[PDB]
Design an enzyme around this catalytic site. Sequence first.
Site, PDB file in Angstrom:
ATOM      1  CG  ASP A 234      -1.844   1.277   1.378  1.00  0.00           C
ATOM      2  OD1 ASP A 234      -2.739   1.549   0.461  1.00  0.00           O
ATOM      3  OD2 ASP A 234      -1.782   2.047   2.359  1.00  0.00           O
TER       4      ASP A 234
ATOM      5  CE  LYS B 224      -4.954  28.213  -0.051  1.00  0.00           C
ATOM      6  NZ  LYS B 224      -3.602  28.367   0.552  1.00  0.00           N
TER       7      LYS B 224
ATOM      8  CG  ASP C 254      -1.831   2.289   5.934  1.00  0.00           C
ATOM      9  OD1 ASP C 254      -1.475   1.985   4.775  1.00  0.00           O
ATOM     10  OD2 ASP C 254      -2.329   3.400   6.220  1.00  0.00           O
TER      11      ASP C 254
ATOM     12  CG  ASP D  18      -4.412  -1.273   2.596  1.00  0.00           C
ATOM     13  OD1 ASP D  18      -4.513  -1.195   1.355  1.00  0.00           O
ATOM     14  OD2 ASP D  18      -3.848  -0.395   3.283  1.00  0.00           O
TER      15      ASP D  18
END
Lengths: 996, 291, 32
Positions: A349, A460, A690, A694
């Site tokens: 991941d 911005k 994590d 997953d």
Amino acid sequence: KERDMDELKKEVSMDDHKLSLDELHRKYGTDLSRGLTPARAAEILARDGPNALTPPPTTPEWVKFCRQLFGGFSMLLWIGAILCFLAYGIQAATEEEPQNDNLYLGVVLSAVVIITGCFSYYQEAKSSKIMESFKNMVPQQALVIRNGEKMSINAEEVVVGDLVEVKGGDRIPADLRIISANGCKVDNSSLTGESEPQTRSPDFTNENPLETRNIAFFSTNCVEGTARGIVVYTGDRTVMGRIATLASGLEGGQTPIAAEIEHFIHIITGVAVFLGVSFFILSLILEYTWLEAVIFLIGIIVANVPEGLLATVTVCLTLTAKRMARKNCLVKNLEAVETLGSTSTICSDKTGTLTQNRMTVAHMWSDNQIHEADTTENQSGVSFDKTSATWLALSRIAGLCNRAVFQANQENLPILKRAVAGDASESALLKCIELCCGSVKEMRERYTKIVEIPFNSTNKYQLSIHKNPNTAEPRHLLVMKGAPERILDRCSSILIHGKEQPLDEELKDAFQNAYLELGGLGERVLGFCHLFLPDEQFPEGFQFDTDDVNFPLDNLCFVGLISMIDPPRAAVPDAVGKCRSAGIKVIMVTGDHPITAKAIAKGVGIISEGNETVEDIAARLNIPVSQVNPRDAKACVVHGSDLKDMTSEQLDDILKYHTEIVFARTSPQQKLIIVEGCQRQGAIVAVTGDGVNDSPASKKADIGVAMGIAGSDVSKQAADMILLDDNFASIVTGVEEGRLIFDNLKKSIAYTLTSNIPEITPFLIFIIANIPLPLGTVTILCIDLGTDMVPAISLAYEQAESDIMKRQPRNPKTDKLVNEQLISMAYGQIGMIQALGGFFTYFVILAENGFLPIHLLGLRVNWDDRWINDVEDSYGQQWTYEQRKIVEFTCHTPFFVTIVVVQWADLVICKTRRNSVFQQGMKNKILIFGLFEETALAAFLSYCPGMGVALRMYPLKPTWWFCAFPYSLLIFVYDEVRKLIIRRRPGGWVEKETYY
Amino acid sequence: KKFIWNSEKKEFLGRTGGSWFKILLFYVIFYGCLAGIFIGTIQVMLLTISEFKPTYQDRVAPPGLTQIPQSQKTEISFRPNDPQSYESYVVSIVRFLEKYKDLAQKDDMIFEDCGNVPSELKERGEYNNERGERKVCRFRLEWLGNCSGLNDETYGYKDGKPCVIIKLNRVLGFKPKPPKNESLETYPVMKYNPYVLPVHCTGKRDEDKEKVGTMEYFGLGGYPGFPLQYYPYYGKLLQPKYLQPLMAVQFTNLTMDTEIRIECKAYGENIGYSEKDRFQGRFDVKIEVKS
Amino acid sequence: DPFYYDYETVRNGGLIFAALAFIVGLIIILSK
Ligand SMILES: *[C@@H]1O[C@H](CO)[C@@H](O[C@@H]2O[C@H](CO)[C@@H](O)[C@H](O)[C@H]2NC(C)=O)[C@H](O)[C@H]1NC(C)=O
Ligand SMILES: *[C@@H]1O[C@H](CO)[C@@H](O[C@@H]2O[C@H](CO)[C@@H](O)[C@H](O)[C@H]2NC(C)=O)[C@H](O)[C@H]1NC(C)=O
Ligand SMILES: CC(C)CCC[C@@H](C)[C@H]1CC[C@H]2[C@@H]3CC=C4C[C@@H](O)CC[C@]4(C)[C@H]3CC[C@]12C
Ligand SMILES: CC(C)CCC[C@@H](C)[C@H]1CC[C@H]2[C@@H]3CC=C4C[C@@H](O)CC[C@]4(C)[C@H]3CC[C@]12C
Ligand SMILES: CC(C)CCC[C@@H](C)[C@H]1CC[C@H]2[C@@H]3CC=C4C[C@@H](O)CC[C@]4(C)[C@H]3CC[C@]12C
Ligand SMILES: C[C@]12CC[C@H](O)C[C@H]1CC[C@@H]1[C@@H]2CC[C@]2(C)[C@@](O)(c3ccoc3)CC[C@]12O
Ligand SMILES: *[C@@H]1O[C@H](CO)[C@@H](O)[C@H](O)[C@H]1NC(C)=O
Ligand SMILES: [Mg+2]
Ligand SMILES: [Mg+2]
Ligand code: NA
């Protein structure tokens, strides 16, 4: 009918978010500004269930205990015990004065299985216990608007269709439908895997309910700003809820180690029933009745079952698991410690596992030069040149003009892992200045802020004017930051080593290419500038009230850019390099944007440098992608948007022809599809994740690896291995230990399987040659469950004969744990010499006591008779029953000692499979103790007062202690020259036939 | 996956033909060498032992005491009328005493007439082969009075009041030593204590000792024991067709239709006993003449 | 007499060895 339920869960979710506020409020019957009355809320609360995931399916402790009492190995010992009681039933009711040998052995086998079950159960339960000490479930209350009032209630007390307000820091309770936001940025990292804090806008943006911005999600935390929203999904009906329920409902599969154990049992029982049946037929051919022949069948078959190998293998696995727990690599499954070594494909991941999942200052632009900042979690990288004045100006612009500060308890924690209030970008800048430019505490108050201008929705920019405490100039210091295009539009001067220069395009375009360098690298860049206001036109008393033009928007002095991104963990790149070095295919599986996933893959090792994608080749030749051949592209990125419209064969082709693959923007269900696709190839798959996304991937994979702190609880429960320290290098440690213990298991198995030949051959020739029994039952138990226990366990402490991380992963269909070469050695050659040595000691004792070996033929007919107390020997002497029986038991005892003597050399040769015993070396202290304990225990079983009365093991005349010596030396020499020929001739014969 | 039997690319039972031949040849040579090694070492073992004496003789320290009717449970149960009921006993008695007939002991070159009176031990030199084949003292059936007879091929034994002769376990070099004249209460026996190994029978408890009324012993010259003139034994190689001494015991006054236990204990200094081996030194029997 | 074997001497020696070899093994797995 649960099949249909699981199928409805494997499908990607849908929504009704794209609805006008009037349509939404009419569908839910809820006030947009007052929520609803408390009675309606309570009615829904007691209607569908409190807002919380249903607890996991509780697993009673007696169930998993009974689980450890069964299996495959323990089941073989169970059928063996049952066969013992069956043969005992055939012997008790049919013959006179039946012997209790089979009963003794049956209860012993039952005890073996029970004791192993208790030990393994205590280990797995211990892991689950320390895992339970990790549930730090802190109750979290939500802010709900009902009846027009703001009430803070328990998350479970929240229902569907009611207004909910969230503040920067609060975790989103249920799945909301945003109706009114104000600078709201939520963290969709644990769910969809989006790295940067995705903002939440009330207007409908994307058809995908995940990529859109009008939906808040369960288990996600509001990073900054505030927002309102109507609850759409609650409890298990939520997004992450439908994912968690899927994780709980998937199948775990069969571990490779367990499959190898099953194949091992196939060979053991195969030869066991072959010998039993062929010898049963042979016994019936001779003279023995069906009554006795059945006992011979069950005896030869049961005797071929390694009773002690169960405990030795369990302890071996337990030992390696102990080493895993020492490195904060917990294993909830006692056999999952091995799965890493056999793994050939790791699906990782990106966000959270590979990366640290935290915005960190990546690179800086100073004096038209790129400076890479340290992005390691433990701060062990190269430090940039922090001595020039340009760095001081840039650091002041970042540390001063930034809405970010530390919090209350943030004092003893490190500079990075501590908590910071504000935007993720501002947090990264604050951590960088606090780590490299001293401290921002006194550096901030040193420049008193007069008037600030925060970020703007459009165009911005963030600026502010501060006083100047330098003892050389009373002018005001104005600072501004923002997007590089905005700063380039509002600047004219450029800073270099302290002095200023005009906006000459020679260095300005040099700034533009650097902007595209950091941007194309997958990072987010910010421009920083400052300017000194003339105190002659802006005196020390002129307050620059924030309304009109009090500061020159243009003519500012640009200092440099500052990029930022979530960096990979410390030992992550090196570990990936080691896995690819071992031959493991690394495939990144994440639901993050491809612009960042490809860059991170290049930075960790999943995408090698120089390898191009189909799009990369298309861009290098300035031609459409439909022209280049995908075979010319070694690596490829698979967008989840395109993965949805794919078949099984197509994904198979993606994996077969592309070596470096990166799956991006993939849903959790698609992660599961990817893992299943990798499993269709017949390879061992490890999934390291994590987030909650997953969870279905970690549950279906051959082995799931979760992060001990940065991993969500769902996937952490669905995983088979936990990394308490979050050190990804533990994956490397794991594949190493897995291969190591696999080979050590081979050695230990061959050891226990070698002793079977001299354990059964006495009973075989007892039936054929009709000679007295050379080896008894209790004496065999002293070998299988006595002496050889410590040598077998010490065989687990063996180290690597060569570099195991250099060889490719094992083939599941070829390299089995117990191949025919192992049987060709243990059951075929070594055990044969051990049996011959035992028979030698047998004839030595009997001939020296008056029964010459030639005279022993056909003697058992009257030898075992309890009343013929005048059996003539070779010297004419008449032996009573107990006299010759004492000789038989004092003939079983040295046979057992002989087994120990030959097991000396057998253990030394099994210690090394290829290397010479001189090359590897007797450095295994547990093995040395294994020999000392084995020898001393063997001597104790023969010379202890009362052994002939309790175990019928009589003392040995010392000369017996040297009958087996030449056979042991012979075994050692033969196996040593065997490994020598395997060393010099790595080609064929000695390696393909004996090397196991 | 279990049809690996054959293929067009040559495999049988799992491997090819040339591989089957290579493995079979290797195993034949390997096992042949193993057999030759085991044979050579067992030959050395045969070279470490002599032909005239066993190296270890301590496991036969206390000699046993066997009987002629080798019963299945040392029990003698038969009918005084039915001749087939006691056939299994008489058959074994005749087969045992078949080598003691006057015609069997006829050669004077291997037999020596010891004497009508039990005398001292007869030592025929050392156990080596320097001397020729030793002589064996004769033992005619007439010594066992009332349990030998001059019957035909079938020894018409005692139906009522049966006969049970006892025999001392033949041990090489064993020299029996009867108890000293200071006999520690040895159940009335004759005064021929110096040249005969005494053997006395009795019941086992207060019941068996009462049921068994009278016992009559028969031996060499009328002594209940074994004469020392027949010891020691010089092995089967040096003394073939050797006849160990015999001594019969008849139970005259028995309680018919009642199983009674008898313990025939042999006494002497060189005669040991054992609580585990009821045959070492002593001897048990369960007689029951059910009519 | 040759029908007697000093089994107590061999037994005592075997136990002395079974004790010494074992304590030596314990010393082996305790390298200090
Ligand atoms: C052997 O058996 C004979 C019987 O055939 C016994 O002879 C009897 O002896 C008693 C004295 O005890 C005499 O009163 C009888 O007249 C004898 N009968 C016959 C037919 O001879 C003889 O006693 C037995 N021998 C021994 C040693 O008991
Ligand atoms: C042989 O045994 C019998 C017993 O079976 C003895 O005779 C018995 O003597 C008792 C008195 O003590 C009487 O009550 C019985 O009636 C007698 N029975 C018979 C059958 O006579 C006999 O004395 C014993 N004889 C010898 C020589 O021991
Ligand atoms: C009691 C006696 C007669 C039984 C004799 C059994 C002997 C002849 C059997 C027992 C084990 C057998 C071996 C078992 C293992 C191997 C390896 C295999 O891939 C080929 C056959 C081969 C080489 C066998 C040859 C014959 C063998 C040695
Ligand atoms: C091959 C070598 C290096 C291994 C050393 C182990 C050998 C030498 C040891 C192991 C067990 C030992 C035996 C242990 C028991 C007995 C009984 C005792 O009352 C006399 C010594 C005697 C007969 C020992 C002789 C030496 C012996 C055989
Ligand atoms: C090629 C060479 C090294 C092999 C020589 C074989 C040697 C090692 C073998 C051959 C015969 C064997 C001996 C055979 C006879 C005896 C007597 C016995 O009561 C104890 C074993 C003992 C003491 C053996 C010890 C080892 C021995 C001497
Ligand atoms: C009682 C027994 C009965 C048959 C013979 O009268 C020999 C004796 C003594 C050995 C004993 C058998 C019964 C089977 C065993 C229990 C046996 O399965 C076995 C199982 C495991 O090791 C050995 C093979 C030999 C055996 O030990
Ligand atoms: C034993 O003692 C008795 C007298 O008590 C005597 O008649 C006999 O001769 C002695 N025998 C021997 C061998 O001394
Ligand atoms: Mg075994
Ligand atoms: Mg993650
Ligand atoms: Na699993």
